[PDB]
């Protein structure tokens, strides 16, 4: 199908986003290295979808590493702090243009797509922490982690500390205050 | 097709959870009467059904219905509201619940066969076994084919209609 | 206070209209039986109540409820659904409707007195007279204080609960 | 087959309904002539579905006769009166036990099934009368004919005139009063 | 209370709207002749409310003339055409700035206020036309006349025929096509 | 007043309920000794309303007794166990006929009245326990105490232990298991 | 699978009907300005789309959406509410409507191919042709890729979100 | 008349709570820009208003609105959704919120005066003082009378309309 063409076009555009942004100019410039809307919603939703897929592989590889050896299981609060930091570090190369991307994700017609992607991400984080909730605690735990991720992402946008050390300190206190329910 | 099996598991988990709450309400009122042992055996039967669907929810990573806190209260109230009428009101509620659960099992067996019996073989065996257990109740004297009063047949239908609405809402929400 | 009298007239007009549809449905099923004359007298009684509230709607320029086409169908269906159960199901519906109408008349009387009995003189007299007619029914053997089956008491309560919801919706919409 | 077993059982039970009714006693007795719930809900819904299928075949056959010249086209008021009478005459063999069947169909858990069957029947009646409505008149016309059918069916239950002549007179006035609306 | 003086302030502002518009500049300039928000919603809603009050006084004065014999009763189609024309002629002094006022009335937070004023106006028109509906025709008649008024008002904004003769011709066809339903 | 006649009639009927029940037979029998529906809803709702009023006065008198130093303030878990026991001990003289009264309160048309009375009772219990919630914890605390009361009331109906000692033991475990959430 | 084609035809018929009402509202306000010819050509384009979907509704006996009188009023009001703001508000509404219609056409194309391209041949060709016309608009200067004001981009998104809700409701009801 | 006072306190407590969440969302995005000090002063102003209404809730035993968890998320999202558009989008949200709060204060003032100014004197004084503070904002350059862009005036109206729906729901639920 032609879906592979646009997937490759969108994949190639990400190499020029830090220079141009999340507009259709980088979509064309990224495609110019391959041979072949202007809002940018498709490019942003593609990047978020691929970053969620990369996170699943990273968490899965750490799970089999702890089930065998050369890795010791850690506490839930420690695990969730590492999963959020791992996912947020994928935004470092695009840190300058991400506030613009967040604005597009917050548009009213993009809200259902952004929420489903965010729900799938925190569901994966809680699964690899060993959640196994079959009651309303399923919604409580995932809503709590979604709020932690979104507020930590906003702190990361306006953070100038070395290696975002003030962002991870904010994440630590957030997670600690949430485990004391 | 995960979306199709998740909807089936979520609504079956919600149905057995609501049936647990109904027998909890009936046991709270009629637990020391002569029908206490019958209600206890019914309650124990659905504890095993709910235990099995909890395992399937963990295995297949199914999202539970968001209406479980609502089924927690409505199930207990319906079970307690009946059995305050008496033993005939309690048994009318029981039959209306068992038939409503077995009715939805048949629909799922039908749609599961039409897609892929080889792939959905383990799940089909479980649903068929549970569907059979929702209808036997002969060692306890509970026969689903009994001439109820004309007013108790309406009450059974109203309860059965309400369970169908709850089933409809739970597989989506 | 036109906003208060309009709400009272609109909900009383809607209640008598729905009662007309219920007895129309009962007459469609049990019209040639032995309870046919009793249902006809009940239907004729509410035709006069509805006629009076039509005049008050024209006089005071009251907006009718937007749910009248819904009460047209649900009233006939409820009246026809009962009386297909039998005469006891029909009379359970009748008592549940007369008591639900008389219940709301009492609430309006106790709030119309607290404002201005001198100003709301004729309206109070009319509502009291109608409230008395909703409960008498002795020449037809319909006694509102009679022992029903435990299941028929639940059916009457469900019908009475549904009428309260309709009354709540009609005075606003 | 699998589902055809009960379909044959239900089909054979209708031969004994006039003697016994719409109960599970005739379901078993109908099967005893072939070899093999208790309220009769499935038997009643099967009979209504089959009668609707018989009606749409009768309307097809009349449509062929008029498009080839063997029959003359009727007006809409005349067509609808004939379609309702044709469908109601299928209840004559079971006229004594039909009030009990209507009671089952009016049970709260059977109402969604009964409404869909009734909606499909009046949709077929309006199609072969040449409706072709794409606006809200689609709902207005079908609701009006559904009310005519249900009230005429109730009149037919309590009618003792020869050949139900008072039922068809009631149907005529009902259709005439609707074509003027 | 203080509501009386602001009513006079709003009343005095209407003398300068044709020169300035429905802004807060005419509110102050109108008050400057008395010696005492910037959106203009209050000024517009006050003008619409007072024009509805003038209409119901005109209609009741014409009712007295026909009840006493000084005037002959008109048909419903003729009565409604005269009532809409009478109400629309109140906009002639402000015809240039009325499209701006309509947009303010169409703002999402002003919609409930505008609808109630429009509902009260068509209710008055139907009452003096002799309407006594207690069924759903109450809503049907008033919705039909509300649509006629709004579309005729839009035609009046862009009309340059002498004495708006093309607006009243449009109103006549709309009323004639509605009485034929 | 007119309504005071109802209050006096209903009040006198409660002296005969343990002999007869919550029917209209005791309403008339109690009314005969003081003055001249058959469901019993009015009598039951009157008894519940008066028992909630008595509980409020009892809680006020204990609050005054502890503010003056004549009593020692106790824990929330201890306070709530005493308030529920105090309210439930009002049902001891009517313990045999209370399951019938509960059935009437659970009728669909009586549910809104029963819920409001139950909500007001647990609101009073939490107020005198020192609750000052303005967030969603207002609903969580009152729903939790309503559930406990209703389940303890059901245990009390079928309890034959001396002085209901197994009912208060059940109440203690329910309160202890709720303070741990 | 008639249930799937009827769902597609009903929601496409409703979408083109609502677009007709929007351009009727815009023509009622801006019909005599310089953008009048552009709105007229847009209105004429959707008259042909709606005419074609009327024929498909008759051919396949599709039930129309029950929210037609609602789209009749809301479409005209939305079209008239914009274009009272000005020409930029009208064009923001137009682009939000054309993109919302073309967005739903793409979803139907990708689900109509996965079932049976041979069976759904003519329907796929029609939807593709209509979807191409929902985006071209070059002879009238209406480019879907234009840098709107930051506030006009929000207004376009709110309109586009509302159309998605209407599309969701219309294919079920 | 505690029913009327409870509605006033509950809906004012909910309004100031939602305004707190909106400025929390705006501070999360624009906290280190040049408009950071202005948003902080706005956030601190509503912290005092919310603190006062918490005391009135405890004193008069008012039931809080059940929708506070919903206003917790929608308020933060609305505040964060704006101020991602920019400073003009943030200030449009601020003015739409302050005007919507002050609009409802005026309605309550004109209803507390018509009942009993002597009895409702302490509450009227507080509401008037808060209503004045919702409109001054001159030390920060935030003028409620400023010519916004035609598209930003629509965005302000949509936010203002949404706040009125929330106010309507909160005084009942
Ligand atoms: C009214 C009752 C339900 C109407 C629809 C609301 C949610 C149902 C649904 O599926 O929403 C779709 C359509 O609903 C929306 O688009 C809702 C957007 C509103 C968000 C405002 C913030 C989402 O599809 P998509 O946008 O991913 O494509
Ligand atoms: C709260 C309600 C919100 C929406 C829930 C809709 C439920 C109605 C529905 O979907 O009906 C289904 C289930 O609902 C019922 O069967 C009962 C509906 C009440 C009918 C009485 C009038 C019909 O499916 P079936 O099992 O009959 O096949
Ligand atoms: C099982 C049934 C649970 C209770 C339902 C009965 C509801 C009812 O009685 O109707 C109320 C419905 O009025 C309400 O307050 C309900 C609020 C929304 C209802 C419709 C939407 C009227 O209140 P009242 O006359 O009992 O006092
Ligand atoms: C424009 C004319 C038709 C609109 C329908 C209508 O009258 O709306 C009413 C219907 O509102 C409802 O409550 C019904 C909901 C359906 C709309 C609102 O009530 P009102 O007090 O504003 O009208 C009284 C005028 N005499
Ligand atoms: C089952 C029998 C009742 C079904 C509902 C019905 O037809 O009642 C009314 C419902 O009126 C309608 O307009 C019904 C619309 C279709 C309902 C389909 C069920 C019409 O009664 P009528 O005597 O005025 O004629
Ligand atoms: C929606 C779920 C709850 C809505 C709140 C509600 O229905 O309020 C009632 C109260 O119901 C609840 O709040 C339920 C929570 C407690 C359950 C027991 C009415 O009580 P009120 O306004 O007189 O305030 C109570 C005393 N301040
Ligand atoms: C009713 C409001 C929404 C309709 C949803 C619904 O259930 O539609 C039914 C129709 O809803 C009705 O029953 C309304 C019709 C008037 C009463 C008969 C099903 O009809 P259909 O799609 O099978 O259409 C036949 C083929 N074109
Ligand atoms: C995008 C999704 C929602 C935007 C974030 C939001 O509104 O959530 C707030 C609301 O916080 C919550 O607790 C929300 C929980 C679920 C929201 C995410 C879905 C977070 O604020 P806070 O953590 O400082 O408090
Ligand atoms: C959801 C249930 C109903 C919520 C709102 C219904 C009642 C309308 C209401 O609260 O009216 C307010 C207005 O509420 C709105 O602004 C409604 C928003 C919708 C308008 C169109 C978009 C008061 O403003 P007003 O003085 O203009 O009257
Ligand atoms: C629930 C009703 C609550 C009460 C208090 C009912 C008792 C009153 C009584 C004696 C009889 C009235 C008959 C009624 C109202 C029956 C309706 C039953 C109904 C609405 C069922 C759904 C609610 C429920 C029990 C939730 C659990 C549940 C979840 C999922 C699937 C099935 C299911 O039963
Ligand atoms: C309406 C119900 C139609 C049904 C379900 C028909 C079958 C009848 C039957 C066998 C009994 C079931 C009783 C049930 C489920 C409850 C009745 C619900 C009910 C009374 C709803 C009110 C709607 C109605 C009848 C409209 C007329 C009406 C309008 C205004 C005020 C009062 C009123 O009665
Ligand atoms: C709907 C009407 C919009 C409400 C208002 C306030 C009208 C004035 C317009 C205006 C000033 C600007 C827009 C403001 C708002 C609140 C925008 C929301 C727009 C919205 C809800 C979009 C859908 C409208 C609609 C039902 C269109 C018809 C339609 C129906 C079905 C399928 C497609 C379709 O286009
Ligand atoms: C609120 C929502 C849904 C968030 C909007 C964030 C989005 C979608 C960002 C894009 C830019 C934007 C501002 C456009 C959307 C416009 C919309 C959807 C209107 C706002 C609706 C609205 C103000 C609803 C009130 C809910 C709310 C914020 C809760 C707090 C609150 C409680 C009580 C009283 C008032 C009040 O404001």
XYZ file of N, CA and C in Angstrom, chain A residues 123 127 130-139 142, chain B residues 2-18 48-68 71 108 123 126 130 170-173:
180
model
N -0.743 3.020 30.119
C -1.131 1.626 30.286
C 0.071 0.701 30.144
N 1.676 -1.676 33.094
C 1.748 -3.114 32.874
C 3.123 -3.663 33.226
N 3.800 -4.183 36.749
C 3.043 -5.238 37.391
C 1.763 -4.763 38.044
N 0.857 -4.180 37.260
C -0.337 -3.572 37.836
C -1.418 -4.609 38.129
N -1.944 -5.254 37.088
C -2.949 -6.310 37.226
C -4.181 -5.841 38.000
N -4.690 -4.669 37.638
C -5.893 -4.121 38.252
C -7.104 -4.445 37.390
N -8.140 -5.005 38.012
C -9.380 -5.328 37.320
C -10.566 -4.544 37.864
N -10.318 -3.514 38.666
C -11.374 -2.695 39.245
C -11.111 -1.231 38.930
N -11.819 -0.323 39.603
C -11.679 1.100 39.314
C -10.269 1.617 39.570
N -9.452 0.887 40.332
C -8.053 1.265 40.492
C -7.300 1.251 39.170
N -7.822 0.553 38.162
C -7.245 0.621 36.826
C -7.285 2.045 36.290
N -8.420 2.724 36.454
C -8.558 4.098 35.988
C -7.834 5.081 36.896
N -3.950 4.946 36.201
C -3.546 5.465 34.899
C -3.805 6.959 34.787
N -8.057 -8.131 18.676
C -8.082 -7.883 20.113
C -9.289 -7.054 20.524
N -9.725 -6.125 19.673
C -10.855 -5.273 20.028
C -12.127 -6.081 20.237
N -12.304 -7.162 19.482
C -13.483 -8.006 19.627
C -13.423 -8.901 20.856
N -12.243 -9.414 21.202
C -12.147 -10.286 22.367
C -12.093 -9.471 23.655
N -11.551 -8.253 23.608
C -11.550 -7.407 24.796
C -12.962 -6.986 25.173
N -13.794 -6.682 24.179
C -15.180 -6.331 24.458
C -15.939 -7.509 25.056
N -15.653 -8.724 24.589
C -16.322 -9.903 25.126
C -15.890 -10.162 26.564
N -14.592 -10.051 26.845
C -14.100 -10.328 28.190
C -14.546 -9.245 29.164
N -14.545 -7.984 28.729
C -14.938 -6.899 29.622
C -16.401 -7.015 30.033
N -17.278 -7.357 29.093
C -18.695 -7.411 29.422
C -19.031 -8.676 30.205
N -18.265 -9.750 30.022
C -18.489 -10.954 30.813
C -17.946 -10.792 32.222
N -16.829 -10.081 32.363
C -16.309 -9.759 33.685
C -17.279 -8.870 34.453
N -17.881 -7.894 33.771
C -18.831 -7.003 34.424
C -20.113 -7.731 34.802
N -20.566 -8.655 33.955
C -21.787 -9.384 34.252
C -21.654 -10.294 35.456
N -20.524 -10.991 35.572
C -20.311 -11.858 36.724
C -20.051 -11.054 37.986
N -19.465 -9.866 37.850
C -19.288 -9.000 39.007
C -20.630 -8.507 39.533
N -21.523 -8.088 38.636
C -22.843 -7.660 39.055
C -23.672 -8.777 39.651
N -16.587 -18.329 41.254
C -15.670 -19.034 40.367
C -15.705 -18.452 38.961
N -16.889 -18.079 38.477
C -16.978 -17.434 37.172
C -16.214 -16.117 37.160
N -16.345 -15.326 38.226
C -15.654 -14.045 38.286
C -14.152 -14.234 38.441
N -13.739 -15.261 39.183
C -12.317 -15.537 39.345
C -11.670 -15.883 38.014
N -12.362 -16.669 37.190
C -11.830 -17.043 35.887
C -11.716 -15.838 34.962
N -12.717 -14.956 34.966
C -12.665 -13.782 34.106
C -11.675 -12.739 34.602
N -11.315 -12.763 35.885
C -10.218 -11.922 36.346
C -8.895 -12.375 35.745
N -8.681 -13.689 35.663
C -7.456 -14.212 35.068
C -7.372 -13.870 33.587
N -8.493 -13.967 32.872
C -8.504 -13.599 31.461
C -8.290 -12.104 31.265
N -8.733 -11.282 32.215
C -8.486 -9.848 32.122
C -7.009 -9.526 32.287
N -6.330 -10.223 33.197
C -4.903 -9.999 33.385
C -4.116 -10.526 32.193
N -4.485 -11.708 31.695
C -3.739 -12.323 30.602
C -3.820 -11.494 29.327
N -5.008 -11.012 28.980
C -5.217 -10.315 27.720
C -5.196 -8.802 27.864
N -4.862 -8.289 29.046
C -4.739 -6.852 29.288
C -6.001 -6.108 28.864
N -7.131 -6.543 29.403
C -8.426 -5.961 29.078
C -8.715 -4.827 30.050
N -9.198 -3.714 29.524
C -9.637 -2.607 30.360
C -10.965 -2.952 31.020
N -11.071 -2.898 32.344
C -12.361 -3.143 32.993
C -13.344 -2.017 32.722
N -14.626 -2.333 32.871
C -15.653 -1.326 32.651
C -15.562 -0.240 33.716
N -15.781 1.007 33.293
C -15.715 2.140 34.212
C -16.938 2.224 35.110
N -17.943 1.386 34.878
C -19.188 1.418 35.627
C -19.223 0.417 36.774
N -18.101 -0.231 37.085
C -18.084 -1.186 38.190
C -18.511 -0.591 39.526
N -22.204 -0.704 39.328
C -22.735 -2.054 39.479
C -22.546 -2.584 40.889
N -22.430 -14.433 22.143
C -20.980 -14.435 21.978
C -20.491 -15.740 21.367
N -11.358 -20.102 24.444
C -12.369 -19.203 24.986
C -13.773 -19.753 24.772
N -14.717 -22.348 27.423
C -15.043 -21.762 28.718
C -16.436 -21.148 28.720
N -19.619 -22.254 31.050
C -20.302 -21.310 31.927
C -21.765 -21.154 31.537
N -21.733 -1.681 29.422
C -20.455 -2.137 29.957
C -19.474 -2.530 28.863
N -19.958 -3.040 27.732
C -19.035 -3.452 26.682
C -18.434 -2.265 25.945
N -19.036 -1.086 26.064
C -18.483 0.138 25.502
C -17.752 0.971 26.545
N -18.378 1.203 27.692
C -17.763 1.962 28.771
C -17.187 1.032 29.830
